[PDB]
Design a protein around this ligand. Structure first.
Ligand SMILES: *[C@@H](O)[C@H](CCCN=C(N)N)NC(=O)[C@H](C)NC(=O)[C@@H](CO)NS(=O)(=O)CCc1ccccc1
Length: 247
């Protein structure tokens, strides 16, 4: 997160931190995610496409720091890693960048709700907030494009939803952005998500209810003028989500 401010997991209870195990014992951060149900975390396919082995991932819930423990946190293994079959990456655009992770603890249980562990709601069929609406993003990603390390404390920021017409302008993304993607940026171009924030939640208040409207996917640079962040439009994926979460 470029700009914005530090926050705690108490203010973002649906946030999931996803790491990958390496040969030796080293564990690095991969992407963020969101708990949409006790046993399910939703993220982005591009995070796991190069290493589709469910046994290498560790999912954390109730975590505020990158490399230390938080009272109340819970560790989970990945029971099932579901990637979207139509995922593809062009010059800039990442299509169908959505994924589901089924979680289970060592005792074979799913998540137990608490002050630091809650689920986030899904949108209704093709029901998105009006453009120009303020939404929040959360993540452990870069604070500046020049950084190579990630901040130790979780961060958050607020950005405005941009319309498809505007995002499709020549100086923006042109025809590279589709109807299955959402553009969001700061009107002043000071704050934005960046590398390390992928898979995380784009949360908007829709009719008094916090809703998972987007998933951090891509963008040209970070916080560059006329180059908004692009998010996977969750509302256009409800059928795919429901079919893979049954049994
Ligand atoms: C998470 O993996 C990350 C989130 C990007 C968020 N960006 C915003 N502007 N909000 N996504 C990626 O890194 C994806 C996989 N790739 C890209 O975003 C690539 C291709 O679109 N974009 S880039 O312009 O080649 C990223 C590299 C870069 C270049 C210059 C300065 C900063 C970053």
């Amino acid at each position: 997160i470029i700009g914005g401010e530090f926050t705690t997991i108490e203010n973002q209870p649906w946030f999931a931190a996803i790491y990958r195990r390496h040969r030796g014992g080293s564990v690095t951060y991969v992407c963020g995610g969101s708990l949409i149900s006790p046993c399910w975390v939703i993220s982005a396919t591009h995070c796991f496409i190069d290493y589709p082995k469910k046994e290498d991932y560790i999912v954390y819930l109730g975590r505020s720091r990158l490399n230390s423990n938080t009272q109340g946190e819970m560790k989970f293994e990945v029971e099932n890693l579901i990637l979207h079959k139509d995922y593809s990456a062009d010059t800039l655009a990442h299509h169908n960048d959505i994924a589901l992770l089924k979680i289970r603890s060592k005792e074979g249980r799913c998540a137990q709700p608490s002050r630091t562990i809650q689920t986030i709601s899904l949108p209704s069929m093709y029901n998105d907030p009006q453009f120009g609406t303020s939404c929040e993003i959360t993540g452990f990603g870069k604070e500046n494009s020049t950084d190579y390390l990630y901040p130790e404390q979780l961060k958050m920021t607020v950005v405005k939803l941009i319309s498809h017409r505007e995002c499709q302008q020549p100086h923006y993304y042109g025809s590279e952005v589709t109807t299955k993607m959402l553009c969001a940026a700061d009107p002043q171009w000071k704050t934005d998500s960046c590398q390390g924030d992928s898979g995380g939640p784009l949360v908007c208040s829709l009719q008094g209810r916090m809703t998972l409207t987007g998933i951090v996917s891509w963008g040209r640079g970070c916080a560059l003028k006329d180059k908004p962040g692009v998010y996977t439009r969750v509302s256009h994926f409800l059928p795919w989500i429901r079919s893979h979460t049954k049994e």
